[PDB]
Structures are given as C-alpha cells and as structure tokens.
C-alpha cells in the first residue's frame, strides 16, 4: 500500500466518508452541520468543489446514488431528518452569495428520533432510498421521477420492535433472490436476545416481511454490510459489534407445499474476530466482496480475506504511527 | 520491410510527423505523440532510431529516441503540427493548447492556451461544465476545433480570444473537422452526417449537409484528398469507409468495408493520394492502393483497390496513424508505437 | 466494468463495445443511461436521445421528448431538426417520441 | 353493454364520461373477457388480439414472452389504476366476478385492493369461504396497523399516541 493525504477543514468531528461509483468523487460530513464534496483531477490530485451546511443536527452518514440517476447525494441527521441533494450545472446564483450548486431538492421528516443511517437501493429496484432511526423503524422512500427529486413517496415502513443503528441492502442483481435489507441495533438492553434483523420483499403480499434474526448477535451493533455477489448461491454478511463477524446466508429451496410466506436460510458463522481488542465501528467490502475492511478503538483499519479453503483470516493492518 | 515496434509505457491516442522543409530531400526524421487514460498524460517528440550502424562495442542505438516531453491536462484527444516548431492539441478538459519545441534546448513549452475553448452550459449562471474537445485542424495562422458541446470555434496563432464561435452546430457530439477551402470547413457527428460550414456566412446554420440513408452510423474521422478539394473520406462506428464528392447530392459515391469496428483515423497519402491508410478498435491497420480518381469508381469489382494489413497480428486498439514520404507511424492502447522508415519495400 | 471513468463519449464507446461483445446487456443499458444523463445534465439533447435509444429505455426516451417539446415552446423552434427527421425505426421507442417524430414530419409536410 | 360485449372498453369508458354512467359493466365485462381467456384455447387468444388492439395498448413493443391472457390482465390492471376516484366498486366488481367463476385473484390485484379496502376484501373472502386467505389477510391487517407496512393497507399512520385513531 501507499498513502496520499488531505487536510479536511471540517470544524468539528467527521462522522462518515463515501466514494462515488467511479471513485472520482468523495463526500464527507460533520458535527459542524456541513457536507463537503471533493473531486479527483486529470492530474491525480483531489480538490474541495463544494462545502455547505446540510442540516441542523450532527450529520451521521453521507451516501451517493448510482450514476444512471445522475449526481445525487443523501445525508441523515440528529435533528431527526434526512435530505436529498442534486448537483446542477449553471444554477449557481450570485444573488445568494455562498450557496452551493449542490441544491437540496427535498427533506424527509418522518423519523421521530435521530436518523442513524441512510442508503440508496441497488438500481434495479429503481430510485429507492432507505433510512433508519432510534424509534426502532426502517423507512424506505421511492421517487416517481428521476428529475423532480423534490417528490419522494414513502412506500415502506418496517418496525423492528428494537432501536436501529445501521442498515444494508442485499446487492443481488439476480432475479432469483427477492429484494432484502439487513438491520443492526444499538440497544444496550439484556432483554433483546438478538441485535440483527433481516427483511425480505414478498411480492405475493407486497410486504417487506421478516425472514430472519441472528440469535448469536446478543451484543450491540454499530455497522452492517452484505458482500457484492460473484454469482454465489449464498449471501455473505459482515457485522461490526464487540468483535468482527462474517455470516453466510444460504436460501433453503422451498418444497412445492410451502406457499404464501417468505424464504428461510441455512445460516453459519464463518468467522468471528476479537483482534481489535476493542469495539468495531465500520464494516465495508471491496467491489467483488472478497476482502472486508473494519476499524476499532485500536486505531487500526484491519483487512480480512478468505484463503483458498474459505478459512477467513486477517491479511493487513493499516494504522497510524503518530509522526 | 520489417516494422519497428516500441513500448512507451503510456497508451498513445495520437501520432503526427514533423512537417519537412519545402524543397528538402530528407525522409521524415521526427514525430510527435499524445497519450490518454493514464494518471498523467503527456505530449512527446521522438526521432526514428538508426538501424544502419554498429560501433566497436556492439550497442544497439536503433531505438526511437525521446527528444523531449511536456505534461498535458486531460486526455490528448487530437494533435497537429502548426509550423516546423509549433504543435496544437485538444483535451478532455475542453482546453486547446499550442506548444513550442526548443531545438537549442531539447524542451517543449506552452506557446498559447484556450482553457475554456469547449464547455457545456446550464440555466442562467456562467458555472460551465467540461466538454471534451474532440478534433483540431490548422490553416496557419488560423485554427478550428470541435467537441461534445457541439461547438465550432475559429482561433488564431496571433490572437487570444475566439475569432468566431458557433455553439450548438449539433445537439450531439461533433467528432472531427477538416478544411475544404480556407473559410470553408466540414465536420462529422453522432448522427452519421457530414455538415459543411462557411465562416463568410453571417448565420450560424450549415451551408450544406450530407448523410447516410436513415440508419445512424456515427462518423468518427474525416480527411479530404490533397489534390481534390471536393473528395472526402470518412470512417464509421461499424468499420465502413465512405468516399464522398461533396458536389454530387447528399450520399457517398463509394462505400467499402475496412474493419470489424469503429475506424479511428483515415488519411490520403500526402504526395501519393491514390493511396489511403486506416486504423481501428478491431486492432488492425491497413494500406490501400488504387493506381476518374479510383476512389470515385461506383464499381470496385471492375476498377481496383488492392488492400494490405500492415500489422502482422491484431493488437489492442490502433487509435491513430501518420504517413510522410516512405515513413509510416501508428499508436495503440497496448502502451506502444509502431514505426517504419520504408512502406514500399 | 460500469466503474470505468467515462470522461469522453469515445472512451465510453470502447467500454460499450466490450460489454456488447460479451452480451453484458444490463451494463450496456447502465452505461447508455449514464451517458444519456451526462447529456441531460449538460442539456445536449441529441446525445441524450441517441444514448437513451442505445439503452432502449422508453421512459428516458419519453423524458428527452419532454425536453424537446418544451424547448420548442421556450423558443418557437427546436434545438435540432436533422436528429428528429433521421429517427427512422427508433421513432417507435415511445408514444411521445412517435409524436416528436410525427410533429417534425408534420413540419416537413 | 354492446361495446362491452364487442370489447371496445375505452370508448365505453368515454361514453360513461359524456353521460355520467357507472363504469361497473365495463370492469365486469373486461374481467369476464379475462375469465374467457384464462380458460381459452388458441382461437379465444386469436379473438383477443383484435379487441386488445382496439383498446390501444400501443406503447408495448411486442416481446415474444407474454400472451393474450397476460396483456388482458395488464389492461384490466391499468384501468383499475387509471380510474381511482371510485376504486372500491371496481375492485369489488372484478373480484366478485372472479370468485363467482372460481378464479384465483392475481397478486397484483389483491395487493392493489389492500390500498382501498381490506374489510370489503374480507367480506368477499367470507362470502366465498376463503377462510385461510381470510386468516392471513387479518394477520397482515393487524400487522399493518402495528407498523409492519401500514402503507400497503392504505393506512396513513400506525397505532400511535401522536396520530388519528
């Protein structure tokens, strides 16, 4: 590995970072109530092209749409809102000096508590956006147009009976798996015997049904990620908690007697890693889902891969030196 | 004879010969290239290595020696010489840059630059968006360029501003451009048309249009016969080669298959123009001999065009060629250049 | 393959050709809609229509027609004519592109 | 009634819009052409393209992957989503016409009528002895009011001390 570095000039704690689909742009958000966009030149540099206030609370994520929907960003907040932003050519008005060409097209206000996470859907579901919040609900919004991004229809609520900290869409472009969403929980109660829940779109009811709940995840969860699918007959799911975990979720083939209800999974833990000696605060996958990254209170981002026997191990440690 | 390939560890989008002194008896000694798809793109000047010699200690000095470079901004979309020391280049940034060689130093420099020659617009503020400048043609002291913005510009090597601009000469991309006569140009587009423009006319609309019949073959390249200002050759998105007489209706006179892909350049030989050359996204490079000018026969099963693949294999894409006297050069996505000193042996 | 930076239409043709050779048809639709959306954000309506035709997306072809039909009323004339005359068989990609083509045919008539 | 038997349903709907007449015979007769198609041999599918074309489905480029039953079900879906102002009566009509012929309800139709009345559907399921579909419809309705997709049952707000009752 080799590193380049950038002074980020956020005026309080940064909470998140996210790439565009091409890795040519990146977004970052802060407790100073700002979002920033930074763009990668045809010289290998990176420059801050927009730096504006997004919300009234601390901003807890930032995320991009797929570029067949153009140049669209979403951000979630401690003020209980989420907001949708579009980059516009030629609108930038000197009549209102120091506003952005990233314009807010809408604000979502439906959450009764801090909005803890926000994720755009896989593009073959259309222009869909999911959020979750500490009222113990996941909300999913559905745009009827790709240009009039002021209008977003709320078309799915999902009550978890527990608080929500993070969410992950299943990246299956294959029509042989239903649309699915996994949900993590910050709940510190000893009464809730499981902190991860998984929901499935059942077209026969048009509901997001529950399929599963991970009864081995007794401990609070901070982040969650499905692995990009190299044709696999089974899903892979990373979780950030007191340790790192990697689960397999293999669909049980229904017999021709099992009408109405959702699918069910043959589920394993393939790996569980304490090695952070501390809590885990993000989990994100490489583009092919073969390498996991995770961070913790040890000041290390740690890299994890399968060997040729699917025995997952730590492969690298990216850590600060403090010089 | 055999062809001297060289890896240069950058993809080459464009190659051009240095223009020879009028009334000299030299071969083409020097060429220029431009690169694309790197973390850093460049424009470079090269000499052809001398395969005629060995000295006592046995070293192979026959390499295509690098004379000097300069770093570019964006991808080098198109490239042309302007005189015997100056060069012009286009860019993915919509910039157009004039450069100068320094023979007493072996360096390149900028000479002049139009950093906003091509750009896309938007509703009511000058926050313009980058539009790739796609092609450049010179008529010293004058210069013309095209782009994704559908803009035509006329620039000058003594002037800093545009001498004329024509925004939205198409609603699609314009790919390439050539001079029919000094105020009179021809452009090609995403639709499968040749549009002709006269800078004497006080409207912005085209003086004439030509096309294929109905179905859209985008036309990526164009050239115009050295001693026939009415004969034009174009290359398609399919790998077809179309010869036109711009005086005789709306269609090509002659239609030939040249490749299994997108044809990226077409050139008539600068002294021998009953000879033609073409390159493509099918990984091949061809010579064509036809010695009415034979290119305008409506039956190529009576009158001849005899046709040779110059490369002994198919590579990654051949983006470009240039040919001067007996010398020919081409440039590729295989991070490589190919050169011969002799095409007639 | 969809994550290659598409700086120019020429680079995007090489990537489309690679996907079309290999029958990667939803990636062909994706890249053609990314190019149609590059063109719509830059208001280059001829590239926007030609790329939505290569994507074969009838909603995107309708949406670009619902720029040309407003761009007409915002001027008294279209920003292109030759692009609307040479629609050929691709006119039939939606009812609104069939109207745009037959409205230019009505001007030509 | 004559246009409905010919299958000229969109001009019958146009005549209902000039004479105030109820669309109920149009929805019942289109459902009855779908029932004739759903048990129909090759002749009844050749008969169908002639009246399907007369209802101007012309935005559908002809794939080789659907048939005369399916484009008739699609037209009936389009009409039940186009004419929203009275939509109980037209879902009630179509579903009563299917159940009186023993035809199972399409998943697009069940999960369209839920956004209109799940109680008028439950009355129909009791009127037609569909007791297990009634048990799971009630199971979904109780879970809708409890915030497991309230919006699929038309419900604006799930059970909360911050909302309508």
From Swiss-Prot, chain A:
GO molecular function: structural molecule activity
Family per record: Belongs to the WD repeat SEC13 family.
Subunit-level organization: Component of the Nup107-160 subcomplex of the nuclear pore complex (NPC). The Nup107-160 subcomplex includes NUP160, NUP133, NUP107, NUP98, NUP85, NUP43, NUP37, SEH1 and SEC13. The SEH1 subunit appears to be only weakly associated with the Nup107-160 subcomplex. Component of the GATOR2 subcomplex, composed of MIOS, SEC13, SEH1L, WDR24 and WDR59. The GATOR2 complex interacts with CASTOR1 and CASTOR2; the interaction is negatively regulated by arginine. The GATOR2 complex interacts with SESN1, SESN2 and SESN3; the interaction is negatively regulated by amino acids.
InterPro entries according to UniProt: G-protein_beta_WD-40_rep, Sec13/Seh1_fam, WD40/YVTN_repeat-like_dom_sf, WD40_repeat_dom_sf, WD40_rpt
WD repeats mapped onto the chain: 9-48, 54-95, 110-151, 159-209, 216-257, 275-314
GO cellular component terms, A-Z: cytosol; GATOR2 complex; kinetochore; lysosomal membrane; nuclear envelope; nuclear pore; nuclear pore outer ring; Seh1-associated complex
Annotated signal peptide: none
Protein name stated in the entry: Nucleoporin SEH1
Record-linked Pfam families: WD40
Keyword Cell membrane: no
Lineage: Eukaryota, Metazoa, Chordata, Craniata, Vertebrata
Any single biological process term in GO: cellular response to amino acid starvation
Subcellular location, record wording: Chromosome, Centromere, Kinetochore; Nucleus, Nuclear pore complex; Lysosome membrane
Entry-annotated residues carrying Phosphoserine: 178, 189
Principal location listed in the UniProt entry: nucleus
Covalent link Glycyl lysine isopeptide (Lys-Gly) (interchain with G-Cter in SUMO2), residues: 11
UniProtKB/Swiss-Prot annotation, chain B:
Pfam families according to UniProt: WD40 (PF00400)
Alphabetical keyword list: Acetylation, Cell cycle, Cell division, Centromere, Chromosome, Chromosome partition, Kinetochore, Mitosis, mRNA transport, Nuclear pore complex, Nucleus, Protein transport, Repeat, Translocation, Transport, WD repeat
Single GO BP term: mRNA transport
GO CC field: cytosol; kinetochore; nuclear envelope; nuclear pore; nuclear pore outer ring; nuclear speck; nucleoplasm
Subcellular location: Chromosome, Centromere, Kinetochore; Nucleus, Nuclear pore complex
SMART domains reported in the protein's UniProt record: WD40 (SM00320)
Repeat region (WD), residues: 7-56, 71-109, 126-165, 169-207, 214-254, 258-291
InterPro entries, per the entry: WD40/YVTN_repeat-like_dom_sf, WD40_repeat_CS, WD40_repeat_dom_sf, WD40_rpt
Gene3D superfamilies: YVTN repeat-like/Quinoprotein amine dehydrogenase
Subunit structure: Component of the Nup107-160 subcomplex of the nuclear pore complex (NPC). The Nup107-160 subcomplex includes NUP160, NUP133, NUP107, NUP98, NUP85, NUP43, NUP37, SEH1 and SEC13.
Purpose: Component of the Nup107-160 subcomplex of the nuclear pore complex (NPC). The Nup107-160 subcomplex is required for the assembly of a functional NPC. The Nup107-160 subcomplex is also required for normal kinetochore microtubule attachment, mitotic progression and chromosome segregation.
PANTHER family: NUCLEOPORIN NUP43 (PTHR22652:SF0)
Protein's name in the database: Nucleoporin Nup43
Protein source organism: Homo sapiens (Human)
Swiss-Prot record, chain C:
Family classification: Belongs to the nucleoporin Nup85 family.
Protein species of origin: Homo sapiens
Protein location: Nucleus, Nuclear pore complex; Chromosome, Centromere, Kinetochore; Cytoplasm, Cytoskeleton, Spindle; Cytoplasm
Disease with which this protein is associated in UniProt: Nephrotic syndrome 17: A form of nephrotic syndrome, a renal disease clinically characterized by severe proteinuria, resulting in complications such as hypoalbuminemia, hyperlipidemia and edema. Kidney biopsies show non-specific histologic changes such as focal segmental glomerulosclerosis and diffuse mesangial proliferation. Some affected individuals have an inherited steroid-resistant form that progresses to end-stage renal failure. NPHS17 is an autosomal recessive, steroid-resistant progressive form with onset in the first decade of life.
Full-length numbering of the shown residues: 439 to 547 of 656
Protein name, as recorded: Nuclear pore complex protein Nup85
Domain of life: Eukaryota
Complex and partners: Component of the nuclear pore complex (NPC). Component of the NPC Nup107-160 subcomplex, consisting of at least NUP107, NUP98/Nup96, NUP160, NUP133, NUP85, NUP37, NUP43 and SEC13. Interacts with NUP160, NUP133 and SEC13. Interacts with NUP37, NUP107 and NUP43. Interacts with CCR2.
Gene of this entry: NUP85
Swiss-Prot record, chain D:
Gene name linked to the record: NUP160
Assembly: Part of the nuclear pore complex (NPC). Forms part of the NUP160 subcomplex in the nuclear pore which is composed of NUP160, NUP133, NUP107 and NUP96. This complex plays a role in RNA export and in tethering NUP98 and NUP153 to the nucleus.
Subcellular location: Nucleus, Nuclear pore complex
Entry protein name: Nuclear pore complex protein Nup160
Reported disease: Nephrotic syndrome 19: A form of nephrotic syndrome, a renal disease clinically characterized by severe proteinuria, resulting in complications such as hypoalbuminemia, hyperlipidemia and edema. Kidney biopsies show non-specific histologic changes such as focal segmental glomerulosclerosis and diffuse mesangial proliferation. Some affected individuals have an inherited steroid-resistant form that progresses to end-stage renal failure. NPHS19 is an autosomal recessive, steroid-resistant form with onset in the first or second decade of life, resulting in chronic kidney disease.
Function statement: Functions as a component of the nuclear pore complex (NPC). Involved in poly(A)+ RNA transport.
Species of provenance: Homo sapiens
Domain of life: Eukaryota
